[PDB]
Amino acid sequence: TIKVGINGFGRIGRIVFRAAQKRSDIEIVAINDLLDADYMAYMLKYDSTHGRFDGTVEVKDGHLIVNGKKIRVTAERDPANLKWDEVGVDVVAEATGLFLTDETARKHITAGAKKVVMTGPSKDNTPMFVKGANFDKYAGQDIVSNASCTTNCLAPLAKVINDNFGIIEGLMTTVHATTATQKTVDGPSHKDWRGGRGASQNIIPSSTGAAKAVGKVLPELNGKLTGMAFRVPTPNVSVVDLTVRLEKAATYEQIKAAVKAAAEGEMKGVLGYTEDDVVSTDFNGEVCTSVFDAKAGIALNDNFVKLVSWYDNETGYSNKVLDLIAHISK
Amino acid sequence: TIKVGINGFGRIGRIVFRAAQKRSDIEIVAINDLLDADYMAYMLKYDSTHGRFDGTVEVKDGHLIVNGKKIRVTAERDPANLKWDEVGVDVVAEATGLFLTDETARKHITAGAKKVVMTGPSKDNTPMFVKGANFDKYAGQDIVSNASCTTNCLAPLAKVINDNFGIIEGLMTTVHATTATQKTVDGPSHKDWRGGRGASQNIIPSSTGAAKAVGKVLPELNGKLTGMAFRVPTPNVSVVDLTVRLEKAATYEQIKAAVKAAAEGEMKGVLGYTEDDVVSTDFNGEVCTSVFDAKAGIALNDNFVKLVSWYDNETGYSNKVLDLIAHISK
Amino acid sequence: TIKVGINGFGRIGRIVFRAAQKRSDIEIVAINDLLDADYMAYMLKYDSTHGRFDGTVEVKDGHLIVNGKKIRVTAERDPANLKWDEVGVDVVAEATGLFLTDETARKHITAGAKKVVMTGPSKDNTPMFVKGANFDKYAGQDIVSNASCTTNCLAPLAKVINDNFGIIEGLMTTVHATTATQKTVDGPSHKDWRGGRGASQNIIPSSTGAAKAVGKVLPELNGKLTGMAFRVPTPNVSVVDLTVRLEKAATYEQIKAAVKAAAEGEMKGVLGYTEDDVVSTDFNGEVCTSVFDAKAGIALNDNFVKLVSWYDNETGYSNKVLDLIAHISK
Amino acid sequence: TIKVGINGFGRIGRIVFRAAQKRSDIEIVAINDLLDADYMAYMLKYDSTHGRFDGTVEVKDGHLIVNGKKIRVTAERDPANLKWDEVGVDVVAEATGLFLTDETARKHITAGAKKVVMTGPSKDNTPMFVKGANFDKYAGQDIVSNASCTTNCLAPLAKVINDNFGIIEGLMTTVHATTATQKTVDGPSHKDWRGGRGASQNIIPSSTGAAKAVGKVLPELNGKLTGMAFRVPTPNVSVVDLTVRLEKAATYEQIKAAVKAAAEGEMKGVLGYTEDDVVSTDFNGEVCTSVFDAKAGIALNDNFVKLVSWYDNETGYSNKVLDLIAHISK
């Protein structure tokens, strides 16, 4: 099995851990964060959003024991001191959001790990990969990025649409759930003022190059998409609203059929499809990174349409982080 | 002064009442709803969203006394029995959402009132009017509609954009606050299933012909706009997200200047403009029916842009309901 | 197996249905409510609070098919016309909140059912039963009540405390989750004004004789307890805060040991016990009707203490509704 | 006028500033925090909870200008470097929560200020004062504490009750609004695990010696009161639930009359009284630090009663912080 180490036990770190427990190809052997093992065990056991951990967890002599397996717990502020090799870590899930450049993420390899997967879009030239879009483009690099949750929702849908009808240009909006970077009440947020305003009280406009980033994993769409977001008072699950002009005329029924076809074929497991009267909570725990909502979209004409797709910003992305780890280890 | 009677003391009814207290041209003399005067006084005095009533309110012998003036309180299930003439009602604000056709709203005139203003889009052929769009088209009709809150936000913005650059086609989304028609927990909503799902827990897709209705008050745009909505966990204030293709190339700076010009000119008081880092609560109590958010919008190119405009779905609309009443009484 | 019919497919009705699927002694064969079978299937399949139904559900010719079994779906406004005997209903779960008196609930027996269980406190003299308190007092009555969710949380705890140390007197408060009877925004609530105020915006004081009702299922405490509640902006799970004066001095450690003993003994399955840093969501789906929070309580002295106990107002109660059905069918 | 400097522009700092604008005896001349003047101006102008600033605010050459007066803006990490004397600061409102001991708060005096008022309970021996309880006990100390919001709500009520009927012992609970120290989603909170759980999703048990602290400002009650709290999903306004055993028998009507008397007499302006069907939002902006809710309380008998009192944890306390400043400057 692939030995994985997790750096950063935040929302993404804890959910990749949970999702990993079902895998048979991967095993989390170590976790690093400024948290004691007993507190780490507590954060794993109880989750406001996803409920109690489905398994056993306990602390035996400064060490965490999940489902019977020992997990090394450390608190190194510098990755280079992690000694991942002592625990035999093959790939490290860099989920701190602090080391998103080659030089910084490199420390993990210097520390004994073979490869690194950033659980966020890279800040430098590090290659990004999105399942359903360009995983096949992996060229053996030892340091990669799984891009962002929104990009993972948008890219798969955009590819289906572009491949079938040709996207001339598109603009998107993501009505996004509240996240850890936000504040409970109006507070300090130096770099993003709107982002400091009370999360549970507001609809908050926010910037995002997730739409632009689609152009990275799908070069054919480079420069044809951009967009923004609105953070709203929900704890989890977001939704993308994509408005596109099509090259080839396509009725709404043809669009639904094309997306349904991909969800049951080439993109099975990544792109989902529904015609039910769903609401956001219906996707809490959703593994697909993009679930097309047939009844929610609306077309003005056969060349100008508004498409809607759901995504559990925590679960979907986390499951694909593991998919990328397994893919670069092949 | 214009004597107005209010039928339906719901959110709209109570807020038009509050906003009317500042007017000098209008006076609310009667209110009709299945609520006792003392309960009516309580709903007026305390408001979770807008705070305590700024004035005096009390019940003196089965009758309500607001700011010193007597208000007739009745509970007629049938408008025809309202005897609006006994209290001298000139115009009636039909805010029950039950009489949105000529025949049904007619009962008010039969009851002694001269004219009727529906606080919602008409269901039949009754003419709709939106301030900043077609108030000048009023042709003395005795029964009119002020259309919907979203249409009041969208129409003014759409006119500025179309007049200046020509809208080829557009699609809009309104991230809308929760309203009285929604449910606190998953409950029965026969005609709109998604709409029955717990409001505070979900992002809820919802239909709306507000975009299409712009084509009514602005015939030049008929058939060029449509859209949908998402109800979210906030108590008040929504926002429109308008994606449009322009006939004439226009940089984002030119778009901002055109909207700012209208907000300070022809559309002063109806269309607002800001370049600040605003969030939804910053518009709780907003009188303008559409406040352009300069920093939130984003353009892909000079002919494909996404525009953002805020609106207090309760306050803005209510203030324009009174504006229409004053306009048809001129 | 015991054939059960459910009248009222509200929150309680749908959750008793879900919980029943795990039982082997009971089978839901019919459901009655003013909802079509396809809408009924939708409400069962998607739940904002408890997630998707763990099983199969579909509509085959005006009839619902859950997990392979056929469920009769009707829409009788009058229970007498239900013909429960045609479907062989043994016991009916009266969950409409409309028939809480013997005469009204009787119609079910007149309709062919053998016994009735009200999923709410009876309004007349009908006997109430709470598991862990007086199920053993059942005297073969054909119509019974399972009392209320709060009473089911309070009674078990009160019994342990009284039996061990003697309750001289107590006052309780339940910080209660929002329910279906509340409003999304300030709306009409004739009989309970505070209750009409926007649920997601307020802490709302509310009356409750749940504390007094403990005196019914536990006559030894009659007249020694009373209390009130506060409805807060959460979708599910409440908590009781019980302040009591004890006859016999008891340290806090002795209190915890006494409650822990009962949770693992006589009250196993009804009364739970924890010493973890739990929060409300940690009990979403909780089957025990009362989970003592050891670390949350606080004693002033050995004879004046404040005890805390959690309860999933939907799940716990629903599971005990089925427990009562199985008990009166023995 | 009294020249005041504010250290810490958090919720308390910004609200004391707003409330100060109405005072004629005090003037804020300087503010210190790690925030630029333009961002400081933004936080002052827009408030999710209390709406837009009622006045003028702008930045003229690195300096803030509020309502026409110049305000010095600095960013010293060490109070000793503040040079309060250069701006002529008489009293400093220490609102960072970092300097709650004499030695640390002393730096302000060393920096040129005459006296210091901690906007939080002192961690050392520094004297605490609560308006309505012991302001008259001020003995000219140069460094004082205004204790906590909850203590300011509880103490005034407790005094009225004790003085009139004699409190043998009491236990209290405060259903408290979410604050800045909490998290938007399950996050790290080393010293208080429950406190790290998603604020908008949970009812969160929390410790508090506010009840015990009443014994400091009212020595006659020392050791007779204690309690705890529950943080809930509301942005502002909390409520205390006080259960007390009385020495002298007192009907509920006698209790209401005693509290009403104090609210209109000795405690006018600090202790409020109502018999209306109020909800939490009805006190957003409330200046009294304790508003007795007559209809919400409930008595078991004439010697065991549960009393309820509201408080805007932001506004009330802030107004009394200024009251203490004015009192120690007399």
Coordinates of C-alpha atoms in Angstrom, one line a residue, chain C residues 30-295:
Chain C
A30 CA -49.5 2.3 5.6
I31 CA -49.1 6.1 5.7
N32 CA -51.8 8.8 5.7
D33 CA -51.3 12.5 4.9
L34 CA -52.3 15.1 2.4
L35 CA -49.3 14.3 0.2
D36 CA -49.0 12.3 -3.0
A37 CA -47.0 9.1 -3.0
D38 CA -44.2 10.6 -5.2
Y39 CA -43.8 13.6 -2.9
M40 CA -43.9 11.3 0.1
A41 CA -41.1 9.3 -1.5
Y42 CA -39.1 12.5 -2.0
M43 CA -39.5 13.6 1.6
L44 CA -38.3 10.2 2.7
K45 CA -35.3 10.0 0.4
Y46 CA -33.8 13.4 1.1
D47 CA -33.4 14.8 4.6
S48 CA -31.5 18.1 5.4
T49 CA -30.9 17.0 9.0
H50 CA -30.3 13.2 8.7
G51 CA -29.0 12.8 5.2
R52 CA -30.3 10.5 2.4
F53 CA -32.5 7.5 3.2
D54 CA -30.4 4.3 3.7
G55 CA -32.4 2.1 1.4
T56 CA -34.6 1.9 -1.7
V57 CA -37.7 4.0 -2.3
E58 CA -39.9 4.4 -5.4
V59 CA -43.4 4.8 -6.6
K60 CA -45.1 1.9 -8.5
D61 CA -48.6 2.8 -9.6
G62 CA -49.8 5.3 -7.0
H63 CA -48.2 3.1 -4.4
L64 CA -45.0 3.6 -2.4
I65 CA -42.4 0.8 -2.3
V66 CA -39.7 1.1 0.4
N67 CA -36.9 -1.4 0.6
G68 CA -39.1 -3.7 -1.4
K69 CA -42.3 -3.6 0.7
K70 CA -45.5 -2.0 -0.4
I71 CA -46.8 0.9 1.7
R72 CA -50.4 2.0 1.3
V73 CA -50.7 5.8 0.8
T74 CA -53.9 7.6 1.5
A75 CA -55.1 11.1 2.1
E76 CA -58.1 10.9 4.5
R77 CA -58.9 14.1 6.3
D78 CA -61.0 12.1 8.8
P79 CA -59.4 9.1 10.6
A80 CA -62.6 7.1 10.6
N81 CA -62.4 6.7 6.9
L82 CA -58.9 5.2 7.0
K83 CA -60.0 1.5 6.9
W84 CA -56.8 0.5 8.8
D85 CA -58.2 -3.0 8.9
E86 CA -58.0 -3.5 5.1
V87 CA -54.2 -3.2 5.4
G88 CA -54.2 -5.1 8.7
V89 CA -52.9 -2.3 10.9
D90 CA -52.3 -3.4 14.5
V91 CA -51.2 -0.1 16.0
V92 CA -51.3 3.4 14.6
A93 CA -48.8 6.1 15.3
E94 CA -50.9 9.3 15.5
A95 CA -48.4 11.9 14.5
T96 CA -50.6 14.8 13.2
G97 CA -50.8 16.6 16.5
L98 CA -54.5 17.0 15.7
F99 CA -56.0 14.1 17.6
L100 CA -54.6 14.2 21.1
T101 CA -57.8 13.3 23.0
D102 CA -59.5 9.9 23.4
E103 CA -62.6 10.8 21.3
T104 CA -60.5 12.1 18.4
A105 CA -57.9 9.4 18.5
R106 CA -60.7 6.8 18.9
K107 CA -61.6 7.2 15.3
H108 CA -58.5 5.1 14.5
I109 CA -59.9 2.1 16.4
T110 CA -63.3 2.7 14.9
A111 CA -61.4 2.6 11.5
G112 CA -60.1 -0.9 12.2
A113 CA -56.9 -0.4 14.2
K114 CA -56.5 -2.1 17.6
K115 CA -54.4 0.5 19.5
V116 CA -53.2 4.1 19.2
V117 CA -50.0 5.8 20.2
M118 CA -50.0 9.7 20.3
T119 CA -46.6 11.1 19.3
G120 CA -47.2 14.0 21.6
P121 CA -48.5 14.7 25.1
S122 CA -52.3 14.0 25.4
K123 CA -54.6 17.0 25.9
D124 CA -57.1 15.0 27.9
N125 CA -56.9 12.2 30.5
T126 CA -55.2 9.7 28.1
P127 CA -52.3 8.0 30.0
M128 CA -48.7 9.0 29.1
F129 CA -45.7 6.7 29.2
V130 CA -42.0 7.5 29.1
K131 CA -39.4 4.7 28.7
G132 CA -37.2 4.4 31.7
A133 CA -39.9 6.0 33.9
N134 CA -43.2 4.1 33.7
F135 CA -43.5 1.8 30.7
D136 CA -44.0 -1.0 33.4
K137 CA -47.2 0.9 34.4
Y138 CA -48.9 0.2 31.1
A139 CA -52.3 -1.4 31.9
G140 CA -53.4 -2.6 28.5
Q141 CA -55.1 0.6 27.5
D142 CA -55.9 0.8 23.8
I143 CA -55.0 4.5 23.5
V144 CA -51.7 5.9 24.9
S145 CA -49.3 8.9 24.7
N146 CA -45.5 8.9 24.6
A147 CA -45.5 12.4 26.1
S148 CA -43.0 14.9 24.7
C149 CA -39.3 14.9 23.7
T150 CA -38.3 17.1 26.6
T151 CA -40.2 15.0 29.1
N152 CA -38.4 11.9 27.7
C153 CA -35.1 13.6 28.3
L154 CA -35.9 15.0 31.8
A155 CA -37.9 12.1 33.4
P156 CA -35.1 9.4 33.1
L157 CA -32.5 11.8 34.6
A158 CA -34.9 13.0 37.3
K159 CA -35.7 9.5 38.4
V160 CA -32.0 8.6 38.8
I161 CA -31.4 11.8 40.8
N162 CA -34.5 11.4 43.0
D163 CA -34.0 7.7 43.6
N164 CA -30.4 8.3 44.7
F165 CA -30.4 11.6 46.5
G166 CA -34.1 12.8 46.7
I167 CA -35.2 15.8 44.8
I168 CA -36.7 18.5 47.1
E169 CA -37.4 20.8 44.2
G170 CA -36.1 21.6 40.7
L171 CA -36.3 24.1 37.9
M172 CA -35.3 23.3 34.3
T173 CA -34.5 25.1 31.1
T174 CA -34.3 23.5 27.7
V175 CA -32.2 25.2 25.0
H176 CA -34.3 23.8 22.2
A177 CA -33.7 23.6 18.5
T178 CA -36.0 25.3 16.0
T179 CA -39.0 23.3 14.9
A180 CA -41.7 23.2 12.2
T181 CA -44.1 25.4 14.2
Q182 CA -41.7 28.3 14.0
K183 CA -41.3 31.0 11.2
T184 CA -38.4 31.8 8.9
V185 CA -39.0 35.5 9.2
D186 CA -41.2 37.5 11.7
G187 CA -44.7 36.1 11.0
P188 CA -48.2 35.4 12.4
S189 CA -48.4 33.2 15.5
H190 CA -51.7 34.2 17.2
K191 CA -51.5 32.0 20.3
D192 CA -47.7 32.5 20.9
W193 CA -46.4 35.8 19.8
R194 CA -42.7 35.3 20.6
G195 CA -43.1 32.1 18.6
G196 CA -43.8 34.0 15.4
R197 CA -40.4 35.9 15.4
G198 CA -37.8 34.9 12.9
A199 CA -36.3 31.6 14.1
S200 CA -32.8 31.9 12.6
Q201 CA -32.3 35.4 14.0
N202 CA -33.5 34.9 17.6
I203 CA -33.1 33.3 21.0
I204 CA -36.9 32.9 21.7
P205 CA -38.3 32.3 25.2
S206 CA -41.1 29.7 25.1
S207 CA -43.4 27.9 27.6
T208 CA -43.3 24.2 28.3
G209 CA -45.4 21.6 30.8
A210 CA -42.7 19.0 30.1
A211 CA -41.2 19.6 33.5
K212 CA -44.6 19.5 35.1
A213 CA -45.5 16.4 33.0
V214 CA -42.7 14.5 34.7
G215 CA -45.1 14.4 37.6
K216 CA -47.4 12.3 35.6
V217 CA -45.0 9.5 34.6
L218 CA -43.3 9.8 38.0
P219 CA -46.0 10.6 40.5
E220 CA -43.4 10.8 43.3
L221 CA -42.1 14.0 41.7
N222 CA -45.5 15.5 41.1
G223 CA -45.4 19.2 41.9
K224 CA -41.7 19.3 42.5
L225 CA -40.5 20.4 39.0
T226 CA -41.4 23.0 36.4
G227 CA -39.5 25.1 33.9
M228 CA -39.3 26.8 30.5
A229 CA -37.4 26.9 27.3
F230 CA -35.5 29.0 24.8
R231 CA -35.7 28.1 21.1
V232 CA -32.4 28.8 19.2
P233 CA -31.2 28.9 15.6
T234 CA -30.2 25.2 15.3
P235 CA -32.1 22.6 13.1
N236 CA -32.0 19.7 15.5
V237 CA -30.8 18.5 19.0
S238 CA -31.7 20.2 22.3
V239 CA -30.4 20.2 25.8
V240 CA -31.9 20.3 29.3
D241 CA -30.4 22.3 32.1
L242 CA -31.7 21.0 35.4
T243 CA -31.2 22.9 38.7
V244 CA -32.1 20.9 41.8
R245 CA -31.9 21.0 45.6
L246 CA -31.1 17.6 47.0
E247 CA -32.4 16.0 50.2
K248 CA -29.2 13.9 50.7
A249 CA -25.8 15.6 50.3
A250 CA -24.0 14.4 47.1
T251 CA -20.7 15.4 45.6
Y252 CA -20.6 15.9 41.9
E253 CA -18.5 12.8 41.5
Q254 CA -21.3 10.8 43.3
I255 CA -23.9 12.2 40.9
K256 CA -21.8 11.3 37.8
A257 CA -21.3 7.7 39.2
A258 CA -25.0 7.3 39.9
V259 CA -26.0 8.4 36.4
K260 CA -23.3 6.3 34.7
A261 CA -24.5 3.3 36.7
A262 CA -28.1 3.7 35.4
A263 CA -26.9 4.3 31.8
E264 CA -25.1 1.0 31.9
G265 CA -27.8 -0.8 33.9
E266 CA -31.5 -0.3 34.4
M267 CA -31.7 2.6 31.9
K268 CA -29.3 1.3 29.2
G269 CA -30.4 2.5 25.8
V270 CA -32.6 5.3 27.2
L271 CA -30.2 7.2 29.4
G272 CA -26.7 7.9 28.0
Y273 CA -23.5 9.2 29.7
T274 CA -20.4 11.0 28.5
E275 CA -17.4 12.8 29.8
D276 CA -16.2 14.1 26.4
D277 CA -16.1 17.7 25.1
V278 CA -19.4 17.3 23.2
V279 CA -21.4 19.9 21.3
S280 CA -25.0 19.6 20.0
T281 CA -24.2 18.2 16.6
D282 CA -22.5 15.2 18.3
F283 CA -26.0 13.9 19.1
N284 CA -27.6 14.3 15.7
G285 CA -29.0 10.8 15.3
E286 CA -28.7 9.9 19.0
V287 CA -31.0 7.1 20.0
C288 CA -30.9 7.5 23.8
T289 CA -33.5 10.0 24.9
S290 CA -31.2 11.6 27.5
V291 CA -27.4 11.8 27.4
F292 CA -25.9 13.1 30.6
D293 CA -23.0 15.6 30.0
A294 CA -20.6 15.0 32.9
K295 CA -18.2 17.9 32.2

